[PDB]
Amino acid sequence: GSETFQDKVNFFQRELRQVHMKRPHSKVTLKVSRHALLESSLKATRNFSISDWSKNFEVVFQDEEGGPRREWFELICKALFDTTNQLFTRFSDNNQALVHPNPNRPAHLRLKMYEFAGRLVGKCLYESSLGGAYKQLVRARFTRSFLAQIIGLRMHYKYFETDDPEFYKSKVCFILNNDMSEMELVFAEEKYNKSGQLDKVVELMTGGAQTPVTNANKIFYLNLLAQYRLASQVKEEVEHFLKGLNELVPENLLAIFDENELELLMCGTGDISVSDFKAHAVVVGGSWHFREKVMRWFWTVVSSLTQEELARLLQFTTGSSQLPPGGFAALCPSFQIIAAPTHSTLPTAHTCFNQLCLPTYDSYEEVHRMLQL
Amino acid sequence: GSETFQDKVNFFQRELRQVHMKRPHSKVTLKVSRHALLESSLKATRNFSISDWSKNFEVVFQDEEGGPRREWFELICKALFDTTNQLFTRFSDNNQALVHPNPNRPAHLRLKMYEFAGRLVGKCLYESSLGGAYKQLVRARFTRSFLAQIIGLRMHYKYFETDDPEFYKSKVCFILNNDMSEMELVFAEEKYNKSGQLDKVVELMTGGAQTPVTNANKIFYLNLLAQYRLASQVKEEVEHFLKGLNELVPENLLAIFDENELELLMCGTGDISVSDFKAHAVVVGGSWHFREKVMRWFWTVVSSLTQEELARLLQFTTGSSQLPPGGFAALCPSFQIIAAPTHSTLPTAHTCFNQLCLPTYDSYEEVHRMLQL
Numbered sequence: 151g152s153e154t155f156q157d158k159v160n161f162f163q164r165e166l167r168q169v170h171m172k173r174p175h176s177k178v179t180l181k182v183s184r185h186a187l188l189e190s191s192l193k194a195t196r197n198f199s200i201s202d203w204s205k206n207f208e209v210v211f212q213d214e215e216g217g218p219r220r221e222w223f224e225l226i227c228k229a230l231f232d233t234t235n236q237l238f239t240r241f242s243d244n245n246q247a248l249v250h251p252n253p254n255r256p257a258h259l260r261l262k263m264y265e266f267a268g269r270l271v272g273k274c275l276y277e278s279s280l281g282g283a284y285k286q287l288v289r290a291r292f293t294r295s296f297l298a299q300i301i302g303l304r305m306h307y308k309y310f311e312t313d314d315p316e317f318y319k320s321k322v323c324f325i326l327n328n329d330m331s332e333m334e335l336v337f338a339e340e341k342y343n344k345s346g347q348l349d350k351v352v353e354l355m356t357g358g359a360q361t362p363v364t365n366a367n368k369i370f371y372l373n374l375l376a377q378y379r380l381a382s383q384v385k386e387e388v389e390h391f392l393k394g395l396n397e398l399v400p401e402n403l404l405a406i407f408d409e410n411e412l413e414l415l416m417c418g419t420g421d422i423s424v425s426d427f428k429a430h431a432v433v434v435g436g437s438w439h440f441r442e443k444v445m446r447w448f449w450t451v452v453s454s455l456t457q458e459e460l461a462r463l464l465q466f467t468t469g470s471s472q473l474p475p476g477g478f479a480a481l482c483p484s485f486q487i488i489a490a491p492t493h494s495t496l497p498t499a500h501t502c503f504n505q506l507c508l509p510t511y512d513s514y515e516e517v518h519r520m521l522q523l
Numbered sequence: 524g525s526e527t528f529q530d531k532v533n534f535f536q537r538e539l540r541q542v543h544m545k546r547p548h549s550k551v552t553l554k555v556s557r558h559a560l561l562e563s564s565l566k567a568t569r570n571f572s573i574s575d576w577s578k579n580f581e582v583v584f585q586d587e588e589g590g591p592r593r594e595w596f597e598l599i600c601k602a603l604f605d606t607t608n609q610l611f612t613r614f615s616d617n618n619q620a621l622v623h624p625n626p627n628r629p630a631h632l633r634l635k636m637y638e639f640a641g642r643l644v645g646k647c648l649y650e651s652s653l654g655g656a657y658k659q660l661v662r663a664r665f666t667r668s669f670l671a672q673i674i675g676l677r678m679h680y681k682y683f684e685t686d687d688p689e690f691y692k693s694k695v696c697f698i699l700n701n702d703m704s705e706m707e708l709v710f711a712e713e714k715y716n717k718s719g720q721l722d723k724v725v726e727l728m729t730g731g732a733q734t735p736v737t738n739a740n741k742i743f744y745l746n747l748l749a750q751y752r753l754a755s756q757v758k759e760e761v762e763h764f765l766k767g768l769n770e771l772v773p774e775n776l777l778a779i780f781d782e783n784e785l786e787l788l789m790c791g792t793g794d795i796s797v798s799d800f801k802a803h804a805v806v807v808g809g810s811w812h813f814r815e816k817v818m819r820w821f822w823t824v825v826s827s828l829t830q831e832e833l834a835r836l837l838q839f840t841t842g843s844s845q846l847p848p849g850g851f852a853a854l855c856p857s858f859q860i861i862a863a864p865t866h867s868t869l870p871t872a873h874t875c876f877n878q879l880c881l882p883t884y885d886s887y888e889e890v891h892r893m894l895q896l
Contacts, residue, residue: 320808321864324880333865346815435693442719491694492706507697 155458158406159415163279165403170276173204180209182222188229188237191222192266200397203273206284223274223286230267231290237263238290241314246474246482248313250293250380251387261390268394275416276398287418291470295380297409299388302401305381307372311502312469313380315482318502322375325368335363337371339378354378410465413472419457420472422464427452427485430478436489440510447517448487448508455521462523469501496520528831531779532788536652538776543649546577553582555595561602561610564595565639573770576646579657596647596659603640604663610636611663614687619847619855621686623666623753624760634763641767648789649771660791664843668753670782672761675774678754680745684875685842686753688855691875695748698741708736710744712751727751783838786845792830793845795837800825800858803851809862813883820890821860821881828894835896842874869893 180194195203209222231238233249237259240247251264277284293313295305310318325335337358343349353359354374363371381388392401407415433445455463461471467485474480483503490498492509497520499506511517553567568576582595604611606622610632613620624637650657666686668678683691698708710731716722726732727747736744754761765774780788806818828836834844840858847853856876863871865882870893872879884890 316808320862324863324865333868335864340810340812342811344811346811348812435689437713438715438717438719439713439721489693490697491708492697495706 153406155411155414155462158411162403162406162415166276166279166399169400169403170204170398173201176205177208178202178205180207180222181212182209183212184225187225188235188263188266191226191229192262195266195269203269203398204276206277207273220286224289226270227274227289230263230270231288231292235259237267242316244315244482246480247315248291248293248470250296250313251384251391253383255387261386264387264390265394268391269397270394271391271416272395272398288416290417291472291474292413292416293380294409294469295376296388297412299381299384300392300395301404301407301409301412303409305373305376307369307376309376309380311500315502317379322372325363325372330363330365330368333363335371337361337363337374339375352378410462410471413465413470414458414461417472419461421457422460422473423477424449424453424460426478430481430484432484432486434486434488436510440489444489444508444511444517445487447511447514448521450514451518451521454518459522463506463521466523467499467501467506468504497523526779528784528787528835531784535776535779535788539649539652539772542773542776543577543771546574549578550581551575551578553580553595554585555582556585557598560598561608561636561639564599564602565635568639568642576642576771577649579650580646593659597662599643600647600662603636603643604661604665608632610640615689617688617855619853620688621664621666621843623669623686624757624764626756628760634759637760637763638767641764642770643767644764644789645768645771661789663790664845664847665786665789666753667782667842668749669761670785672754672757673765673768674777674780674782674785676782678746678749680742680749682749682753684873688875690752695745698736698745703736703738703741706736708744710734710736710747712748725751783835783844786838786843787831787834790845792834794830795833795846796850797822797826797833799851803854803857805857805859807859807861809883813862817862817881817884817890818860820884820887821894823887824891824894827891832895836879836894839896840872840874840879841877870896 178198180191182194183190207219207222209218211218211221229235231249233239236252236256238249239252240249252259271288274286274288277286293309295309295313298305298309307322310322337354338351339354340348340351351359354371354377355361361367395401404412428449433441436444452460452463464473465471468481478485481504483505486503486505487508488505490507490509493512494516495509497506497508509520511520551571553564555567556563580592580595582591584591584594602608604622606612609625609629611622612625613622625632644661647659647661650659666682668682668686671678671682680695683695710727711724712727713721713724724732727744727750728734734740768774777785801822806814809817825833825836837846838844841854851858854877856878859876859878860881861878863880863882866885867889868882870879870881882893884893
């Protein structure tokens with residue numbers, strides 16, 4: 151007695167067409183330069199209205215005259231979100247980590263660029279809504295904290311698991327997994343300069359320095375910390391990003407989504423290859439019953455899953471519905487299935503380690519029901 | 524106001540010489556065959572007495588006639604403990620894991636071989652005790668559970684972290700880290716055949732099947748499980764191993780040691796190469812203060828440590844005082860230093876992941892005091 155992902159998408163796409171019923175089904179031209187794509191794409195659209203952003207894009211590059219439309223969307227997305235230009239950025243220096251608006255941006259990237267990003271993400275959602283002909287998926291692996299800011303949610307420390315592994319593994323886990331009664335931590339963060347000298351302490355709330363982290367307020371600490379690191383340092387960039395987004399897509403429409411659904415709505419169910427999965431996956435622990443009966447039920451159920459559920463699975467265990475550049479062999483920590491000692495419990499995960507905690511199930515049909523996350 | 528490792532060693536070596544004052548400082552010959560070293564080494568010594576095991580070994584191989592004594596000790600240790608002959612064995616199919624008497628031995632390995640193992644480990648300890656001239660270190664990476672059985676200690680689930688990672692990671696961690704109030708586990712273990720059919724359930728105590736794992740008896744479960752997996756299945760092999768050990772080394776002498784000290788007494792402080800350490804070590808998380816000031820204090824303190832403390836460190840973070848075959852580049856998970864958010868707390872570790880949890884220290888001298896485990 152509630153709503154499936156597909157239902158939300160149809161409602162969202164319908165509501166969105168109706169928002170633009172009065173916007174025109176006609177043509178508008180862009181001329182862009184592969185050399186400097188972002189800069190030329192901004193200038194191409196500098197004179198456009200909201201109405202113009204609704205019209206079908208006729209893209210022409212210099213040095214070759216639908217084929218270029220797809221090519222433009224592909225490249226513009228990379229240009230913005232691929233982090234080369236450090237407009238977006240990752241917290242972990244791993245080149246498979248998810249991306250986030252730059253907390254401390256080079257001055258040479260104005261806030262107009264974030265607004266443009268939002269218009270572009272807006273346009274992909276909008277064209278995606280008109281039919282299979284016009285579909286444009288966003289080619290980007292966003293942080294959950296960023297997707298959540300788009301929707302309008304409070305930050306929670308769970309977001310660190312996906313957005314700053316180093317930081318979850320190192321500090322958050324420590325705090326969650328230790329007695330705070332013999333540590334003397336507080337509700338401040340100490341910032342240090344390039345070199346490593348304490349330039350300033352920053353209270354997460356008034357008297358934060360005076361307030362010690364107990365075991366009772368441990369969680370209030372961690373989320374005050376989530377607010378600070380993931381959202382507080384990027385208010386401006388996100389505000390402009392969704393000024394742009396909200397021109398084509400009103401914010402109230404996106405409320406019906408959580409962060410992982412919004413990823414699936416923006417970037418699609420992708421194409422995930424059970425053959426690549428089987429090849430670079432890893433199994434850990436479990437009886438002969440697990441190693442032999444459960445894991446073959448698993449791979450059977452897997453080859454019997456919609457492109458949509460295969461993505462729901464990849465997202466539930468790794469953090470994103472999307473594989474990095476190098477497919478399953480690029481996953482930071484290899485996609486792994488750990489045996490739980492339970493029978494007939496809900497399967498769990500640890501997305502920091504790309505780990506799926508698969509109970510030792512008694513029937514094929516119980517594996518099938520449970521891999522339908 | 525207690526006793527340093529070195530003090531224990533001197534007491535142990537002195538007490539041990541005095542046990543053999545009346546045993547003779549004369550010669551006895553062995554003739555062995557590299558082809559079949561264990562079998563020929565048994566037959567070489569089949570006729571010997573306890574008294575004979577005290578005498579200096581003159582070893583002759585077939586096909587070349589101190590140089591062979593060292594060579595024999597080197598090879599005999601490998602023959603027993605290197606697990607090729609599956610006399611000893613590892614739980615994890617990783618070829619860097621620690622070794623344990625075989626729970627389910629090929630019939631073609633009699634119990635006399637375990638007794639011989641004990642005599643050999645005995646002899647190494649004994650010759651080691653006479654001086655630098657006679658020193659023979661045991662070349663083996665034993666499970667902590669095995670070292671603890673030698674000393675005469677109860678099994679504790681902590682031993683799984685070092686002895687069966689797969690099993691700690693998969694089952695033990697799960698139980699320690701979850702609410703048992705919504706799982707319905709019990710004080711039994713289910714054994715399955717080669718194929719994967721439930722042949723028999725085994726209660727860890729009377730009515731174990733009837734007794735549910737609560738959050739209150741979670742630990743009693745885990746250690747009853749430690750007894751079962753690490754000790755219960757090898758009573759006979761260990762009994763014979765220390766029949767042999769106790770001929771040259773009375774058991775009461777070894778009581779003054781814990782498992783990690785007994786490893787250092789048997790196998791030495793080895794030779795561990797700060798240059799190899801620096802090269803294949805890994806750092807995770809921490810401020811610029813940590814990344815820049817603390818980690819250089821660390822590597823400084825490291826190059827200023829006795830061979831003995833360097834081993835105490837390697838043991839505290841990886842599980843053994845001894846590197847695998849391929850030096851630091853062979854460590855299952857790379858030797859890693861994680862930043863803790865604390866200042867001036869005792870450094871902690873996770874030996875399953877070869878992880879050292881190094882607080883963010885305020886002085887060089889605080890790093891020095893704390894790396895003296």
